[PDB]
Symmetry: C3
Subunit: 524 residues, 3 copies
């Protein structure tokens, strides 16, 4: 009954092509309609292959527009390019002037940082004097600022580095004084030592204008320091081999409110004696998930107490690779929160005190091992950069909701010549009374030096050591860059419907027809 069931199907079905093939007029008619059906099906499949290829590519649609939705005021991190305090540096210069031998200066100072620095210098110097020419590269790394920072307790350095009271002369967010003890947070940098981060107390709307922004006056000069008739250097502290080296000014980093700043990768420089204007144009980027792109809401290596950034993830991935291979952490990269209690690669590993007296081969072997650790870390950093598979293995992706800022950099000398610039001196020393901050028991030396240097007669030259920062929102409207799926499932279904209705002519109520036909064939 195959002929009968196919004939009944052809007479009752809605399939637009089958009846002509079944109820053919002649052999040539059946052949033609067969080739028409074949051609329709072939073009159908060829087009659907392209359609499904487009869909499974998972394209993205990106829109850029200006929206009034506000973003939080950026956090400002300031690092003084002079890492140590003026008094400590002057004291060190005077001691090295008085006696060049570091061994004689171990217990000559009341400051713990000076004593530790002298101990380290005395422990390293005899080997330097004996083996400088034989192994110059080893001592080029041992006598470095980062190396000393990794071998001295951070709590000891923090008391000798730049202090907030001696760095931020004045602060003003909007029309109110900054709560200097509530808004400023101190964090440690291997090269800049003490650094300070400003966080505005708080969603809220963003106000425009310089007067509505963040204005601060900082002491960043080095004219207070003693001037030497001949060049003399503090070992380790003065590093001519660094790319920053003897730079004078402030390193300013503009970043979201709850993110770790990275001065050596991002930020801006402000010379002393100039007023820097930072016109901030906010931006927001919204990203979508795995099938269409890559984004992450949290740092894989983090602890979940900081706003996510891709730079932090990449740096922590590099640190993870360094720790895994070399067995130590690089001081130039953040410590892993989940893998604490890891010694720095530049740590001397309890370098013995007896090396101060004899430059024995054992002490040199310890320094050799330190240099080998540094070289291991450096090689791992370079290898991983080219090793793209390692970067992908860390699963570092851009944030799914990122706030970023564009900076309009500008400069202008802050203390004007003549009586125009007297306002700066009156504010710093007459109203804020900057000198009287240091009239304390343990800060008398700084007080006398600032009293002598900043007297009224030398106003024009002395005031050049100060700098002013103005961080203001120049455009309250935020440029939003939102990513979205370009080709959804509904659009895919619509395209499939159009192609089904164009080429083959069948529908879903008509693909039931063939289902009933196959049931009838089964139960024939």
């Amino acid at each position: 009954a195959i002929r009968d069931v196919m004939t009944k199907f052809a007479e009752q079905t809605t399939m637009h092509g089958v009846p002509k093939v079944i109820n053919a007029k002649s052999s040539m008619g059946r052949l033609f309609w067969s080739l028409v059906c074949l051609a329709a099906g072939a073009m159908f499949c060829l087009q659907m292959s392209e359609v499904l290829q487009r869909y499974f590519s998972y394209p993205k649609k990106v829109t850029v527009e200006v929206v009034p939705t506000p973003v939080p005021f950026p956090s400002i991190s300031i690092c003084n390019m002079r890492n140590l305090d003026v008094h400590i540096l002057n004291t060190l210069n005077r001691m090295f002037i008085e006696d060049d031998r570091p061994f004689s200066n171990i217990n000559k100072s009341e400051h713990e940082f000076i004593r530790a620095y002298m101990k380290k210098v005395a422990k390293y110097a005899p080997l330097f004097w004996n083996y400088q020419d034989e192994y110059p590269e080893v001592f080029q790394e041992i006598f470095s600022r980062t190396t000393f920072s990794a071998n001295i307790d951070p709590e000891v350095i923090a008391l000798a580095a730049v202090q907030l009271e001696g760095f931020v002369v004045n602060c003003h967010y909007a029309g109110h004084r900054c709560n200097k003890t509530r808004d400023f947070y101190r964090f440690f940098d291997p090269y800049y030592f003490n650094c300070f981060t400003y966080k505005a107390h708080e969603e809220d709307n963003l106000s425009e204008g310089i007067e509505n922004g963040w204005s601060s006056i900082l002491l960043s000069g080095s004219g207070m320091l003693d001037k030497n008739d001949e060049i003399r250097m503090l070992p380790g502290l003065h590093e001519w081999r660094s790319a920053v080296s003897a730079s004078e000014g402030v390193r300013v980093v503009i970043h979201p409110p709850s993110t770790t700043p990275y001065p050596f990768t991002e930020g801006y420089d402000v010379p002393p004696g100039f007023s820097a204007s930072f016109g901030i144009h906010p931006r927001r980027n919204i990203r979508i998930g795995p099938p269409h792109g890559n984004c992450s809401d949290k740092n894989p290596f983090g602890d979940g107490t900081e706003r996510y950034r891709l730079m932090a993830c990449q740096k922590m991935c590099m640190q993870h690779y360094i720790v895994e291979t070399c067995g130590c952490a690089d001081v130039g990269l953040p410590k892993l929160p989940l893998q604490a209690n890891i010694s720095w690669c530049r740590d001397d590993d309890n370098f013995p005190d007896e090396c101060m007296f004899t430059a024995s081969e054992e002490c040199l072997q310890l320094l050799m091992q330190l240099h080998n650790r540094i070289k291991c870390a450096r090689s791992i950093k370079s290898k991983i950069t080219k090793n793209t598979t390692a970067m992908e293995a860390c699963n570092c992706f851009p944030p799914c909701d990122e706030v970023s800022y564009d900076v309009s950099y500008s400069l202008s000398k802050w203390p004007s010549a003549g009586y125009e610039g007297d306002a700066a001196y009156f504010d710093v020393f007459g109203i804020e009374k900057f000198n009287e901050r240091f009239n304390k028991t343990g800060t008398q030396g700084k007080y006398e030096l600032f009293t002598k240097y900043f007297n009224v007669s030398n106003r024009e030259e002395s005031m050049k050591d100060f700098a002013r920062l103005n961080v203001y929102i120049a455009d309250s409207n935020v440029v939003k860059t939102q990513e979205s799926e370009d080709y959804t499932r509904n659009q895919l279904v619509s395209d499939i419907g159009g192609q089904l209705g164009l080429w083959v002519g069948i529908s879903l109520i008509t693909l039931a027809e063939v289902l009933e036909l196959i049931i009838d064939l089964f139960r024939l």
Copy 2:
């Protein structure tokens, strides 16, 4: 005849599903085909709900591309950070040196601005001397530069502020001299007093290169001013509490040719003694209408004689809210063109002259009312910023066709050391003959001071007071950001057609079928 009409319909209709339900093979067949039809309709409706939700969302499509279509050369507005003329400031300093009492200096000068300033200072001082400690905040606002600008006639300040002849030493657009009297327009700023806007005489194509741009030399230094052995201040004029304060240099704003500049929100700073290069990269943004977005072709609060900007609309909305509530206009925001004849909030409201002799409680009550007005304006400004509904109520939207500029900021000391820098002095004083401009009857004092200060021997130090601005188009091709409707009505119709042809199988020539069926049912 219901059965007959439905049977005839099923036998003659093209509806792909109904005939199987009507001409059912059996009860199970009718049930199946009914559930197939129901399922098709349900999926149809579920997909069309999503489709219509997408359509009525009115999505936008944004394209970013580089096009050769030119944009007009940007207008350049320059404000000298020294608001007053050198002669006026020196005279004021000398008078305050000679006699500290302002009452004795009312009629001691021939300049009207000096007389008005002395009158205001003498009217405010007795209350300051008596009530400074009791009400410090009130006098912190009364003795302000903005307050004095709002209580002195602008036509009086304009003659004492910085003049164009004494500010723009030289100008050159392309290879031709700037028409200094045709291209420069003076406008008043509450803090910078006199400011000047350059408008190029003119669509036209944009030329690249520094030599094809706008080059000008300006006198912005303050070394000409007298240097005092002790700090003495001009009340109101010197404001240590401002975020700009004693800054020295030029405030440069780059904006479209026919727009009001806003130096305190946008612009760049140029220190004296440096050559500033402003590499301009033009941009154009095209936006579309209400159903898909928000854009406006004209400022709602404006008069229609200026190119539209969103910043102007927002500032005028803030001014409108201030005037409505406090009954006065803030001097820090533009005056409303449609609501002229409104006194500033900082206006003293005809403060009597008798206060110069007695510090009576009545005079203090008038100052108290002035302070209350200032505080009302400040509170309204802060409240409206958080009050997002007010911002929406002003109907401020970004322009539908906006031209914007990106600035590449750079600096370099303009007068080179040695004979290299002699070209600057030769141009300023040998060819332009800058000193001989001031050899007039009412400008002799300035002429002598410039003759003494800018002599040949002191060339190296004296020339540091000048600055040079170079504004040039760095990329003649414009980055265009055009917004367009992503999902048009035709695309919606195509998607509806695809879905109709996929799920239900009906068409419009087939939805006539049911129309005839219902007519037949009516006329049965």
Copy 3:
């Protein structure tokens, strides 16, 4: 048999509308169904006109996203704003001090460049002394730096201009010393004379951080030059009429590795005595072909040995138009590689030596022709800019795959005051031994001057002539802007299918139906 064939067609066809028109119930029925068919067809055609208008518009889809794919480290081109060597300039100043007459100084120097310069000055001066007032404009162009560069052999200028050994004190890419003879390439600029381009030796991944970037120290000051008691000028070399003129510092251009820099259109300025930080944010733009946009993979006027840029194409198009009309090439635009051996427009065309003795009318006519050539070139440059058809005729299009860089500009005084800045002097003169480079047979004069100027006691002032550049990648992730076709042929086919299934109801297996019908009509 027309009625029979149409009836059989209507009874057997799947066309959803024709059977109702053919097998009409009544006259009103036939009329209605005819108008329904007409309406369906009309709406169909109206929608397809819009669809085809959208398709043949060839719209583009642009996506902006952040990707980890690296781009090559940018090439850095540095031009000293002091074009000539210190020794040559000092010698010229001394000779013009000793004797003002240029004719007496023809053979007084051993340097070939000085002799050629004196010959040119002596050939031009007698006409200048006689006809300065009559034709000031002619001599304003003849006595120009560009004019002298076009009339003196480049190989002669290169030996007298700034040398690499006396310009780049130190270089460091990543942690390694730059191969100063392999990575630096010298190229000639008409205004800056000798300029140098740095190309990193090498796809490769991009490393972040200042210490991983390019750090260099350059001598760019002019304090070494003799200071004159009175203003005296070198004719042609000192050009007060230029927009750059007496600027002191370095012109820094950041561009892709294999592209010609254009300092006068792109770049940044760095003053001496400051450390410039160039935070590089890379970008990549991908563009598509003729039907959807315009892009080119190679410069039409180029030789195919340089990475394509639109700026180069536009400049070479301008040069092509200048050469075609004026018969000469402008020195301010690149020479056409395919049309070499073309004299500059500013070339004096073998100006005779006899003019040194007599200011005859013939010599003035030659200078007049030179001025006419310059004016022709200038007029052609201006005319072509407005002549948009010429710009289109050159077929200059943006590159199909372009790499661009965004620069974060910052400054900070490099040599710190006091012992902090001793590192810079120790590096320059103690380790690099900058003075000892010039202790050669033909450079003794420079050696003595640098020995005297850079002594230890004058460390603070003398070191201000140096500058430091730090070019580092601030964001290793690249912002990609890719253009793609928005409306493909497959989408067009899907929309046609949806519209065919919505309005008219026909398919392709049903447009065969009418093909068989017309065959039957033919063979009736």
